[PDB]
Design a binder for this molecule. Structure first.
Ligand SMILES: OC[C@H]1O[C@@](CO)(O[C@H]2O[C@H](CO)[C@@H](O)[C@H](O)[C@H]2O)[C@@H](O)[C@@H]1O
Ligand SMILES: OC[C@H]1O[C@@](CO)(O[C@H]2O[C@H](CO)[C@@H](O)[C@H](O)[C@H]2O)[C@@H](O)[C@@H]1O
Ligand SMILES: [Mg+2]
Length: 580
DNA sequence: GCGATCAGCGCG
DNA sequence: CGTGCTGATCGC
């Protein structure tokens, strides 16, 4: 039967106890400047549902929300914190976030609502959000009676689940990871998302106009060389033009038809002039649809800022993800796409963009965890790691390392990090397995400590059932015991890769926490805007650059102490593009 | 037609 | 290797 609760018309004192499960419901997936549809509070005095117009206007309730001594347990407190920031209300005292707790216990569960986390502890007296709000075009906020009970049941679940979740985190030695890292980081991400990044829309629009011109020209050139018109963006129609009308060789096949990936086209380029044009068309087309039109779609017209949402509880490695827009994959590798960054500017006049990035943090982390003497010495000498790798695997002096040799050694360092494998490397360097295996073997011959680590971590994953990062993040790998070579191999590569990528994630997250504490102590106006896996982007008055040049790198380099140094490069400029 | 897939490409 | 976003596509 239904759950008992008071559907209050006004805020009372017992609703303001110093310990409670709190629900500040924001149904819109993108919570920026979004509506709060209801509030539920469960504490020692009972269960309560409050209408937002009432609670959020009540001085006492707002004070309670902002009182750090009044502890609240929630699910996705960042969502509520940001929704409240847009209304000028501060949320403090969140001592437990069920979403983050569940995430740390097992990222693989994909916990995205209270019901999912509750199911982990055999608690099912709460419905999944999707069941209550529906989804897609049919998504909608239910009538008060249905809404109120759902919010109360969620608060009730959080109230009941706090202790068991904290107990397991403690057994896993992950309690500090939640309380001292992820929860404090949650508040920092909330400030970052709320601050947003300023966009020079006029510059973006002009770039868009020129791209349209260039696309038109390349588009026509393509129809000319094809002898007809067709939907270039249709892998099916394109496949017909390339492999049937033009008789280009089929080197790669796709489940549905002909593969037209850039990888394939690159090899087909020598056969026909249409290929290079299709490649150029896709490059510009990607820029136009995603980084110009797509970006312009999410810019707030009143402030000209984009407010991303950092998903802190999604990746299996501990990395953050970014959406609406995704600001972690803005072009940089190719100059034409890199120009897109000229569109991201400081939010205030006479302010500048400051970007700091870790130099090879993953390989440094690997040197530390594997305790490989050669790799540690390489970083202690701050050597060019790819040139050094080439020197060792190809057995030549530094001056004997050719450009192609370094390129291949670089690709090997790529593979060693993401889980070295014949297929992966071979196909990546466009070579054979017999050859790729030879490189790998040569690499392990030069870095025996890394080989030992790879063997040991795999064995450890099979024994314990999971692998861990420097700060105790965990990833379960049940497929590590699969009798299917492919499935088992993937699991083994994750056993190898996760402690590396995951520890690098732990480090930069701590750096963000340490950095914000330093910025505040120094009372600098500088603030974080974005995190891109191994780099931090800030904006600050031009008068703070010299101080940031010393502070940011130091804080990032000292976040943790490894057997090898951590090195941070940095640049600043009038736009993100110039922060190079 | 709606949402779900597929195929291709951007980043670390 | 992973997330995420795009235009096409197919599924019921
Ligand atoms: O609020 C972020 C937080 O919510 C979850 C669901 O619990 O994701 C929702 O919000 C994201 C940001 O708008 C969307 O990308 C996602 O589709 C939506 O379900 C968590 O995954 C996330 O940590
Ligand atoms: O030849 C041993 C070598 O193979 C790997 C896979 O590259 O693991 C295989 O052999 C182990 C026994 O030594 C099994 O536990 C594992 O399941 C199987 O795939 C390496 O880890 C190992 O060094
Ligand atoms: Mg870097």
């Amino acid at each position: 039967a239904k759950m008992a609760f008071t559907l209050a018309d006004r805020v009372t004192e017992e609703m303001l106890a110093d310990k409670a499960a709190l629900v500040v419901e924001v149904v819109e997936e993108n919570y920026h400047d979004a509506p709060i549809v209801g509030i539920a509070v469960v504490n020692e005095h009972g269960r309560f549902f409050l209408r937002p117009e009432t609670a959020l206007a009540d001085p006492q309730f707002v004070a309670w929300l902002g009182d750090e001594t009044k502890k609240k347990s929630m699910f996705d407190s960042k969502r509520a914190a940001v929704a409240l920031k847009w209304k000028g209300i501060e949320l403090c005292g969140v001592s437990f976030d069920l979403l983050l707790a569940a995430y740390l216990l097992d990222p693989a569960q994909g916990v995205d609502d209270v019901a999912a986390a509750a199911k982990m502890k055999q608690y099912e007296a709460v419905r999944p959000d999707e069941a209550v709000y529906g989804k897609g075009a049919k998504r909608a906020v239910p009538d008060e009676p249905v809404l109120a009970e759902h919010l109360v049941r969620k608060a009730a679940a959080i109230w009941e689940l706090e202790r068991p979740f904290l107990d397991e985190l403690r057994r896993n030695e992950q309690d500090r990871l939640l309380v001292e890292l992820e929860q404090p980081l949650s508040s920092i991400l909330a400030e970052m998302e709320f601050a947003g990044v300023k966009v020079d829309t006029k510059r973006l629009e002009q770039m868009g106009k020129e791209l349209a011109e260039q696309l038109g020209t390349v588009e026509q050139r393509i129809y000319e060389l094809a002898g007809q018109e067709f939907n270039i963006n249709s892998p099916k129609q394109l496949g017909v033009i390339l492999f049937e009308k033009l008789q280009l060789p089929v080197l790669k096949k796709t489940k549905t038809g002909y593969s037209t990936s850039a990888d394939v086209l690159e090899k087909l380029a020598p056969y026909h002039e249409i290929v290079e044009n299709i490649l150029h068309y896709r490059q510009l087309g990607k820029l136009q649809s995603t980084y110009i039109e797509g970006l312009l779609k999410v810019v707030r017209p009143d402030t000209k800022k984009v407010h991303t949402i950092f998903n802190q509880a999604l990746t299996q490695t501990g990395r953050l993800s970014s959406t609406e827009p995704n600001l972690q994959n803005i072009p940089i590798r190719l100059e034409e796409g890199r120009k897109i960054r000229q569109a991201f500017v400081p939010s205030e006049s006479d302010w500048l963009i400051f970007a700091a990035d870790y130099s090879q943090i993953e390989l440094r982390v690997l040197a530390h965890i594997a305790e490989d003497d050669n790799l540690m010495e390489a970083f202690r000498r701050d050597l060019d790691i790819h040139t050094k790798t080439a020197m060792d695997i190809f057995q030549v002096s530094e001056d004997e390392v050719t450009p192609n040799m370094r390129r291949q050694a670089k690709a090997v360092n790529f593979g060693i990090v993401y889980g070295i494998s014949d297929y992966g490397l071979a196909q990546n360097l466009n070579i054979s397995r017999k050859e790729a295996a030879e490189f790998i073997e040569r690499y392990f011959e030069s870095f025996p400590g890394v080989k030992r680590y790879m063997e040991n971590i795999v064995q450890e994953a099979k024994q314990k059932g999971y692998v861990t990062t420097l700060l105790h993040r965990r990833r379960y790998l049940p497929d590590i015991t699969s009798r299917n070579f492919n499935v088992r191999s993937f699991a083994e590569r994750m056993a190898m890769n996760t402690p590396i990528q995951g520890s690098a994630a732990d480090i930069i997250k701590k750096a963000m926490i340490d950095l914000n504490a330093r910025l505040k102590e120094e009372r600098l106006q500088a603030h974080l805007l974005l995190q891109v896996h191994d780099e931090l982007i800030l904006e600050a008055p031009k008068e703070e650059m010299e101080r940031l040049c010393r502070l940011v790198p130091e804080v990032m380099e000292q976040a943790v102490t490894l057997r090898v140094p951590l090195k941070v490069d940095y640049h600043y400029g009038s736009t993100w593009y110039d922060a190079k």
